[PDB]
Design a binder for these strands. Structure first.
Ligand SMILES: [Mg+2]
Ligand SMILES: [Mg+2]
Ligand SMILES: [Zn+2]
Length: 354
DNA sequence: AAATTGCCGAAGACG
DNA sequence: CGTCTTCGGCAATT
């Protein structure tokens, strides 16, 4: 039964081919745009991220995430209150001085110009039906809508890339030492970290200058390298069901959010965060044998329900950042979601049948 | 040094 | 399950 659901969630190669062909052409064109000439964005480089490129996108290849990352030397980070995740960026005749607000590099000013450029470049595409969606306050995304003729969205995310050691709020995060190990953890933390122009919600409004840490590159590496054994899911090793559990949980949330508006505050990043914690708690590949898919999925569910009940789901890279805090999500919303998940769980998941 | 190239891993397709 | 295939990521090459 979960096996039947996975078969239906699995992406079709024909759909993948048709979608990738069009997405790649539009993205290449926009990136070449940025890269020329006089632009404050001239050195951007592309990094594909999120569930399609991690092979956990479900149902249809209809949403792609791509970062246009800019290396910015000598940046100084000031943590925004004690949030752990949010920062003001300042500096130690640069192109970026246009985006200054005092000595602070404004996320909003820089994103606005980035968006402005993308829109003008989209206007020049005559051979493909592509438009820029209305902007969402506080989001770091410039979202394209492509009609292929099927609808595909592409989120183009500006990012700052910094090569220094990671901010100290991350020092006790990424607790992979008994799963992926200390050499892996140390090596991942020697790679750059990223900031995206997603604004902190501060009371009734966004703080327009703030940026948020991103570990999309690390998350992508983890999904591609997720077993305690080096051969997990390789051609000379044993398949596990870790990614299948993540797909099933993302589907469950998606189906629930489609029918209940009260679940608007929940998102697939909560599910991904929860399963990173579960992969830490249950590190052995033998605990994710495909023969045991039903019980692995059940355990992930039990853990997610416990997060809800205790109002606690800490960011995997930034442990003091509680994604399920009362400030982010009302207690009533979590209680509403717990009720729905329990009903599905106790009734053999009728919602999987649509 | 911007653009092309091939290698091969992940995973869909199909028997 | 095996074998075949395409897409993506990498970096040397040029
Ligand atoms: Mg996505
Ligand atoms: Mg997205
Ligand atoms: Zn595996």
């Amino acid at each position: 039964k979960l096996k039947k659901v996975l078969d239906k969630l699995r992406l079709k190669r024909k759909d993948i081919s048709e979608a990738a062909e069009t997405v790649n052409k539009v993205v290449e064109r926009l990136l070449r745009r940025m890269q020329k000439r006089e632009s404050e964005f001239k050195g951007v480089e592309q990094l594909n991220t999120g569930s399609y490129y991690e092979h956990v996108k479900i149902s249809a290849p209809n949403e792609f995430d791509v970062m246009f990352k800019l290396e910015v030397p000598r940046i100084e980070l000031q943590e925004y209150y004690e949030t752990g995740a949010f920062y003001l960026v300042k500096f130690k005749g640069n192109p970026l001085s246009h985006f200054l607000e005092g000595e602070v590099l404004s996320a909003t000013k820089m994103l606005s110009k980035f968006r402005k450029i993308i829109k003008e470049e989209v206007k020049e595409i005559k051979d493909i039906d592509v438009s820029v969606e209305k902007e969402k306050p506080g989001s770091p995304a410039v979202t394209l809508l492509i009609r292929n003729p099927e609808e595909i969205s592409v989120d183009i995310i500006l990012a700052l890339e910094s090569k220094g050691s990671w901010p100290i709020s991350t020092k006790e995060g990424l607790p992979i030492q008994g799963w992926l190990g200390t050499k892996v953890r140390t090596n991942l933390r020697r790679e750059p970290f990223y900031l995206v122009p997603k604004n902190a919600k501060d009371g009734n409004s966004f703080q327009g200058e703030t940026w948020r840490l991103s570990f999309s590159h690390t998350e992508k590496y983890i999904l591609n390298n997720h077993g305690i054994e080096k051969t997990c899911c390789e051609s000379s090793g044993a398949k596990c069901c870790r990614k299948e559990c993540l797909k099933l949980m993302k589907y469950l949330l998606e189906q629930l959010k489609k029918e209940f508006q009260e679940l608007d505050a929940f998102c697939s990043y909560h599910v991904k965060t929860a399963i990173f914690h579960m992969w830490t708690q249950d590190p052995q590949d033998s605990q994710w044998d495909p023969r045991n898919l039903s019980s692995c999925f059940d355990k992930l569910l039990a853990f997610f329900l416990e997060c809800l009940r205790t109002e606690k789901l800490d960011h995997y890279f930034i442990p003091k950042f509680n994604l399920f805090s009362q400030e982010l999500i009302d207690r009533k919303s979590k209680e509403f979601l717990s009720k729905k998940i329990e009903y599905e769980r106790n009734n053999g998941f009728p919602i999987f049948d649509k």
